[PDB]
Amino acid sequence: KAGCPDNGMSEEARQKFLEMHNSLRSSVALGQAKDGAGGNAPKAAKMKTMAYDCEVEKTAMNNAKQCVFKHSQPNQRKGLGENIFMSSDSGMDKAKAAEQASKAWFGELAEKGVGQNLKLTGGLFSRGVGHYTQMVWQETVKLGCYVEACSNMCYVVCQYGPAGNMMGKDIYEKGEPCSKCENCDKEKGLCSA
């Protein structure tokens, strides 16, 4: 969560990023997340808790500080996934940007729909739900993000340790919350190491 350098990113913003991610992963794991394809997203049997990672934030920073809205190429973030977001409000509070970015990515579920088949098929990936799927990717347990105030945008980049969005793999295992992990509160649905 912390022990990160004084590099332009604030503790408040890191906190918000992590809290939003774990909170939203919990909502999904508990069967409480509204799915645009109908009903709610399926309950998750072993949705893993995320931790904040300063090293992942550094590579997210490398993208953000370029002030060009685009995905970085894989080898500029070796082994990591990535979500990107922008707002025209360039001087936005960094925690506010974290909240807005996290909501925009997660919103893909409610807006575009995913459905009850969580295998990441070519069909599913091409529908543009890939920011959401990375946020709730079961095996992704490291989060690191950077918010950069650019000339004409606030630019937010999050990166994700173990990369998610592996084609042909399930986003997460379906089952009752905590049913396939030990360190997990049935009312939260998040598995700790």
Which residues sit in the known binding site for Zn(2+)? 71, 131
Q: What is the dihedral of CA 115, 118, 120, 124, to 10 degrees?
A: 0
What is the Cα gyration radius of the chain? 16
Query: Quick one: residue 21, left, alpha or beta (phi over 0 = left, psi -120 to 50 = alpha)?
Result: alpha
Burial of 193 (0-12, 13-18, 19+ CB in 10 A): exposed
**Where would I find the H helices in 65-93?**
none
Q: Which residues are annotated as a binding site?
A: 71, 131
Q: Which residues are annotated as a binding site for Cu(2+)?
A: 71, 131
